[PDB]
Chain length 163, copies 8
């Protein structure tokens, strides 16, 4: 029942993207919490959240941010837990600023970075699931079933119908 | 002790980068295997490697490649294990090709992507350590020590 | 009657782009097949499709994908046939991720890469036609006529009409 | 034996790159010609070369250029033959200029584009080989051997 | 009366951009011609147009194209006249492909390149005007008046009105 | 009452962006002036504005421009005052041209550059405020209150409501 | 004299760049402190440093970092002081990563960003000087002299 | 003979690039002047230079600069003469900054922009020559000869 994944994001405007991570964890029956933590507007909130995450029982953090996207990296600075980063698509630079400011962590403090946007959010949840599945055989079986269904559900040919 | 992390790379030319991952895992006493597996030149080797990884006892795969870098993605396609991707710096485009071809995975098949180059290789090994630490207390304590020493070791001022 | 070109793509969403390759092969009376093969969701389907392509009588493969676009390159890993790659335009990065993940093949495994989007799909079909035309004189004549008409159909001046 | 592939490049400075195409064709015993043809400095040479390519017995043209790289595109404009384009690495922009000015052909006139640099030059020759192999069984068997040896030759682990 | 500037473009779709060059030459009373010449679909048309441009009395060529934009550069290969290049904005890459394929001419064959899009087209006409003005004092006076008016017409402050 | 910050921009079309700087200075009760100065169309206006800014009592200049964005840099060439640059988002290149042409000043003439677009304009005003606050204790207290409110106003969790 | 500018950088490897800021402040006789403070490796050091900067008498902070460069932004998050950011040139991406991760601050927390590299480090110190000059007449006169000498010193023609 | 082309550059560091423009004008016997004029460090020098260019008899200005490259644009702001812009290759961003800050002029004030680097400097001088040739028959014949020799001199095949 207690959360084992934390999904955090800098603002409400990130929710349109991060909701995909939430939905997938729920689908796979992974208890989690979903919070707003602003690296720039609530830096002490971030420090406290990241430094206590492990003792609160969290195993993985999924962090989403856009633009000068510092939330994943700074979270990783304060926790020993694996931190997964979702670059939120930005208006001008289409998430390239988000992507580079998350993935280009210097050696010593990792953030496992996923694709720009909704795909990245979904995949952050799947990656979290695959981490948790290493020690949780029921979840491993649910993930196997999920991946197997994804594969079996791919059609053989396109619907080539003109309109 | 049987390996719990697999480090794979497309070619010898990737080793200058991926050796940083190997060194870090060794420093933390994480049993691992370090292999060349080419998505493009040995696709069946890759398929076999990835599909049997879990049953062989691997927990995490770290995959490095450059250019049109397909090794991490395709590895992830064949395993349920977490796959971590290291973009190797390419000659012309400085690993931007490597980066985009690894990180931009469509929803459904993740690769946790690290920085271009040596930093990414080191961090993939650290990220793998932090994953393993979740269910290995002795390793968790060694990782805590590693992180603590990294933090404590930063000087207060630059030298000239 | 049996197909001599295979058009493959990762998903239905690629069809909006890849249909242009289909239309042009049909226009030039080139028998072909059109399939969905996902590099990431159906990797064994891909392996089987590519490794058997030659014995099934295929001469050219046209492969389209977007984002982390691995389908053309992995197809080329398993076939000795020429593989032509169409970068499908992606939402955030406008097909630059598609383009780099297709064209930047290391030495040893080629993918002949065309333009991002519909233009690339049309041109993949024309390039395939020009390959096939080398051994097929009827098709060579149809291609010559096609290219000649394209040239003769270019207007001499723009319609400069204000609106 | 009359050439069936033409390798053309805009200048001597492209040769460091395009020599990889020449070497590969020679390795596979594909008769070819290797020439300098500048889209910008010898545009009439280019026109003549491209328009007569087919009647001279050429089957594939491999064209290399850098910067505002127009040689492959314009070659394709004048021939019905398949034209393969090699972006040469440029000094400032590392072949991104070369790449975009070759690959982004409008619909109607294709250029099959390979990677920036030596890799692209090698792969253009391989792609040309795979085209020719469709109607030359002996060459198809040599290409099969080449691909098989590439695959079998990849080591299983890196050397230090 | 006879044209002294040639405006050329690859297709009708370029006219939305190149019309700005046409309008400005007309405004400055510069006789010119406006044509479609496709580098890729009518390469012999291009060769003939560029090689005869000087003897036909043209002094400047303004050439517009998008994507793999070869029309300005190839025009310059065949004429000794100054050639001005307008990168037409492309769909996927926003004219960056247009820009690089026009401006990055190797040493020996220049194209004077202007901004991506309508601004570039307007400025190609102004640059042409400034070239012609060197030998044409009536035009020099019209250009001076034009530039002077542009400067005098800039407002001192923005209209800060809320809506 | 007399202005201590100058907000300048190249054209009316920049106002949609620069208005955010104006609004924030007003919010913080910072007297300022807001003007159009075109680097390219009114270069002498710019020279006069920048060279007299200090003697007129200005302490900070906020300059906004897009495309080949020279207004901030040239302002800084003629004043000893701190100049803050706002890259206005451009149509084709999304403000990347704006950004590089403002931030990449060679050593010797600084422009403190903020984010592309509205965010940058808001932050140029906040940065100006933080500069002025160093010598103005009433303003320092208003800025502290503002920053404190920003921090306290961040919600703890997203509104996760489906629609 | 107590420092009124703080120069901070993530690591020794940044010093080759940030030394230009230090030299300029020294040239203008601006008391300052020059420190290593890592956003990623010493986040609590950063928090303390930034939150106490004002009460320690600092007026401006100049922060340099490369790659995923978070030091300036996070410094600004904890201080009301003006923070100036120097993108350090990174190996692979030449400071484009550094630049975007520093300049693209969301509204509410500014960082005044300078050019990638040594130029940016020098200009951050000049920009800090121009800020301090607003309420220090002696410094304003020294900055006027510095700017005047820069202008007067430019040669009229190049040397060969 | 009074100069009819002005070559200007922001600093000595631009000379390695702009010397190619100077050499070409000399080769074609085009009287010119070659000067350092900094948009940022000598803005009044620039204003004077550009505003008096025409009355001094200049016909074309070639302006080179790097980074946030404002010299060509601002020159064009003050003269009715055609201004040609040479993006100097910058250290970090390889002249992409230079290129965008020169070519992306808003409508109303043109700069005819050439390639990044030495090529652009050479081509700015050629473009200036082609402008002058319109009303100088002797020069037009020399330019014809130059272009003809360039074309005729291209080899037919590469050397090894």
């Amino acid at each position: 029942s207690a959360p084992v994944v934390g999904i955090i994001m800098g603002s409400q405007s990130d929710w349109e993207t991060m909701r995909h991570a939430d939905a997938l964890l729920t689908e796979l029956e992974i208890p989690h919490e979903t919070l707003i933590v602003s690296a720039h507007r609530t830096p002490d909130r971030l420090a406290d959240y990241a430094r206590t995450a492990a003792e609160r029982g969290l195993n993985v953090i999924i962090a989403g941010a856009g633009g000068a996207a510092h939330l994943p990296g700074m979270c990783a600075a304060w926790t020993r837990l694996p931190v997964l980063g979702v670059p939120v698509e930005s208006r001008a630079l289409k998430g390239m600023d988000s992507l580079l400011s998350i993935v280009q962590m210097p050696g010593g403090v990792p953030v496992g970075t996923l694709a720009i946007g909704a795909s990245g959010a979904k995949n952050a949840a799947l990656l979290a699931a695959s981490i948790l599945a290493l020690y949780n055989p029921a979840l491993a079986a649910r993930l196997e079933t999920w991946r197997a269904l994804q594969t079996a559900s791919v059609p053989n040919s396109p619907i080539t119908e003109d309109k």
